[PDB]
Design a binder for this molecule. Structure first.
Ligand SMILES: *[C@@H]1O[C@H](CO[C@@H]2O[C@@H](C)[C@@H](O)[C@@H](O)[C@@H]2O)[C@@H](O[C@@H]2O[C@H](CO)[C@@H](O[C@@H]3O[C@H](CO[C@H]4O[C@H](CO)[C@@H](O)[C@H](O)[C@@H]4O)[C@@H](O)[C@H](O[C@H]4O[C@H](CO)[C@@H](O)[C@H](O)[C@@H]4O)[C@@H]3O)[C@H](O)[C@H]2NC(C)=O)[C@H](O[C@@H]2O[C@@H](C)[C@@H](O)[C@@H](O)[C@@H]2O)[C@H]1NC(C)=O
Ligand SMILES: CCCCCCCC/C=C\CCCCCCCC(=O)O[C@@H](COC(=O)CCCCCCCCCCCCCCC)COP(=O)(O)OC[C@@H](N)C=O
Ligand SMILES: CCCCCCCCCCCCCCCCCCCCCCCCOC(=O)CCCCCCCCCCCCCCCCC
Ligand SMILES: *[C@@H]1O[C@H](CO)[C@@H](O[C@@H]2O[C@H](CO)[C@@H](O)[C@H](O)[C@H]2NC(C)=O)[C@H](O[C@@H]2O[C@@H](C)[C@@H](O)[C@@H](O)[C@@H]2O)[C@H]1NC(C)=O
Ligand SMILES: *[C@@H]1O[C@H](CO)[C@@H](O)[C@H](O)[C@H]1NC(C)=O
Ligand SMILES: [Cl-]
Ligand SMILES: [Cl-]
Ligand SMILES: [Cl-]
Ligand SMILES: [Cl-]
Ligand SMILES: [Cl-]
Ligand SMILES: [Cl-]
Ligand SMILES: [Cl-]
Ligand code: NA
Ligand code: NA
Ligand code: NA
Lengths: 279, 99
């Protein structure tokens, strides 16, 4: 099927000093935000009418309270253990947890944590695995967290039992938005000169959904291997933008075209033709 | 180690003077998360700007999208202004139709 295949929650907990800490959070289907989190109130924000998936109001409220207690509790516990862990303020902790649907139908769950923008820990087989970058500190954290069977069990249930049924429920509930097809528009421009006697030609592709797209500089039916793809950039309203560039000598730009293939075009590729001397 | 933001400014549609469009500013690769982003019209802050909630990539670097609806003209100048702990003063990246 097309569109996102995973769901994840992210946490960014910023510890300014011994008395001040704040956490930002959100829920996502791949790169598409479906939940917000109010840092102040500790309540979820449902961004889409189908953001609760097939979960009842009861179960959604239960999970919000799990996250509310966890988020408040996490800052409380990090502040209390900051001395023992030789933490210098300010520091920032990040976490990502969720699950994903694979080809063949298996659903795989993950949980990763970071400290100072570096990998700190991960969860494999419902256990705390310290990352090498986390050093002795991540080894001490995994020793501490496994002492508390309450946290371990709650994490296991959320990762391996709650997330998979939530994912299937929300992919279904959101299909009118997630599996829609939006056509790209494309245009050509001239980039900065990459070197002596050379031009840079740019093929812009914008407004497409879903994310998979194919863009190549061509000479007839021949793909130009020099084609450089920029990073896929977001647009507002769940669409994407991409630039495909080509470095050529001035006298060799004639005969070039840019070809765009996307699921929404139903086989009718977009073809733009470069024409010389400002035509 | 703190990472300074990368700033990319681009329009949703090819610019055509007098035609409705969207100006995007994608701020990425920064750490820590605290950041200030503004979109400017002739150096003046645009009040009706929308933005994504904080997210991060696989290397844990943060990213945000700030966008506003705009109509390009021959003379109106647009830019994205960002402040972060890694910078002494706000960094300004001007929107360029030809770049
Ligand atoms: C939200 O949706 C989830 C997914 O639902 C399915 O997909 C969506 C998109 C729609 O198309 C739905 O109509 C469709 O149901 C729901 O979770 C799914 O629930 C079903 C039960 O309805 C459940 O099926 C059962 O599976 C077990 C076996 O499960 C084990 O083994 C499989 C591999 O084989 C493995 O993948 C699992 O993880 C487990 O290890 C099976 O024993 C059951 O059989 C019994 O019931 C059937 C009739 O249903 C009967 O014919 C049999 O004879 C026998 O009595 C049954 O087939 C799915 O496994 C489950 N999917 C996941 C990923 O968990 C979800 O339902 C709720 O959670 C379920 C876990 C279960 O408690 C339900 O009763 C709950 O309502 C739904 N709602 C919520 C709130 O999550
Ligand atoms: C429908 C929309 C939503 C979609 C569904 C979302 C599916 C989510 C998918 C993945 C999430 C994984 C969750 C990881 C967060 C930890 C949760 C927790 O332990 O929380 C508890 C923990 O809270 C604390 O005690 C604070 C301690 C936190 C510090 C621990 C930090 C460690 C966290 C990382 C775990 C790594 C270790 C992995 C080993 C298995 C608090 O919960 P509680 O039940 O105790 O609260 C009770 C509440 N019901 C009413 O009172
Ligand atoms: C509903 C809608 C859904 C909306 C919900 C959106 C909000 C969700 C936010 C929650 C996201 C959960 C993501 C998993 C978090 C994994 C975090 C792991 O963090 C680390 O990496 C640990 C780094 C800690 C080092 C600091 C040392 C202090 C140690 C404190 C030990 C505590 C001991 C506890 C006892
Ligand atoms: C992955 O997690 C499994 C569940 O916790 C592990 O099995 C468990 O092994 C424990 C031994 O320390 C034991 O207490 C558990 O009761 C048992 N769980 C089950 C499924 O009954 C699993 O590896 C096991 O342990 C190793 C040492 C061998 O005895 C294997 O045969 C077991 O499967 C974990 N696998 C890892 C860590 O790679
Ligand atoms: C702690 O951090 C907060 C948040 O930035 C700050 O306003 C406050 O002044 C700090 N407290 C002290 C006493 O340094
Ligand atoms: Cl605090
Ligand atoms: Cl330590
Ligand atoms: Cl798994
Ligand atoms: Cl940090
Ligand atoms: Cl064109
Ligand atoms: Cl428009
Ligand atoms: Cl706007
Ligand atoms: Na517009
Ligand atoms: Na203008
Ligand atoms: Na351009």
């Amino acid at each position: 099927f097309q569109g996102p295949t995973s769901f994840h929650v992210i946490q960014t907990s910023s510890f300014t000093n011994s008395t001040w800490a704040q956490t930002q959070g959100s829920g996502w289907l791949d790169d598409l935000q479906i939940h917000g989190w109010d840092s102040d109130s500790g309540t979820a924000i449902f961004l889409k009418p189908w953001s609760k998936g097939n979960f009842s109001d009861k179960e959604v409220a239960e999970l919000e309270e799990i996250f509310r207690v966890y988020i408040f509790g996490f800052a409380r516990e990090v502040q209390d253990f900051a001395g023992d862990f030789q933490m210098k303020y300010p520091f920032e902790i990040q976490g990502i947890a969720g699950c994903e649907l694979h080809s063949g139908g298996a659903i795989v769950s993950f949980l990763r944590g970071a400290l100072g923008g570096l990998d700190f820990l991960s969860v494999k087989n419902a256990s705390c695995v310290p990352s090498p970058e986390g050093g002795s500190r991540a080894q001490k954290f995994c020793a501490l967290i496994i002492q508390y069977q309450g946290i371990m069990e709650t994490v296991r249930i959320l990762l391996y039992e709650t997330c998979p049924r939530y994912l299937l429920g929300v992919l279904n509930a959101g299909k009118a938005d997630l599996q829609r097809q939006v056509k790209p528009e494309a245009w050509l421009s001239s980039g900065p000169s990459p070197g002596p006697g050379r031009l840079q030609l740019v093929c812009h592709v914008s407004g497409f959904y879903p994310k998979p797209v194919w863009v190549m500089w061509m000479r007839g039916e021949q793909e130009q291997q020099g084609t450089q793809l920029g990073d896929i950039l977001p647009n507002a309203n769940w669409t994407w933008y991409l630039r495909a560039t080509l470095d050529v000598a001035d006298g060799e730009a004639a005969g070039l075209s840019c070809r765009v293939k996307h699921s929404s075009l139903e086989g009718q590729d977009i073809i733009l033709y470069w024409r010389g001397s400002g035509l | 180690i703190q990472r300074t933001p990368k700033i990319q400014v681009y329009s949703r549609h090819p610019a055509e003077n007098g035609k409705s469009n969207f100006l995007n500013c994608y701020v990425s690769g920064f750490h820590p998360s605290d950041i200030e982003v503004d979109l400017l019209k002739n150096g003046e802050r645009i009040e009706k700007v929308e933005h994504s909630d904080l997210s991060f990539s696989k290397d844990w670097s943060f990213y945000l999208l700030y966008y506003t609806e705009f109509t390009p003209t021959e003379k109106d100048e647009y830019a994205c202004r960002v402040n972060h702990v890694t910078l002494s003063q706000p960094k300004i990246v001007k929107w360029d139709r030809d770049m």
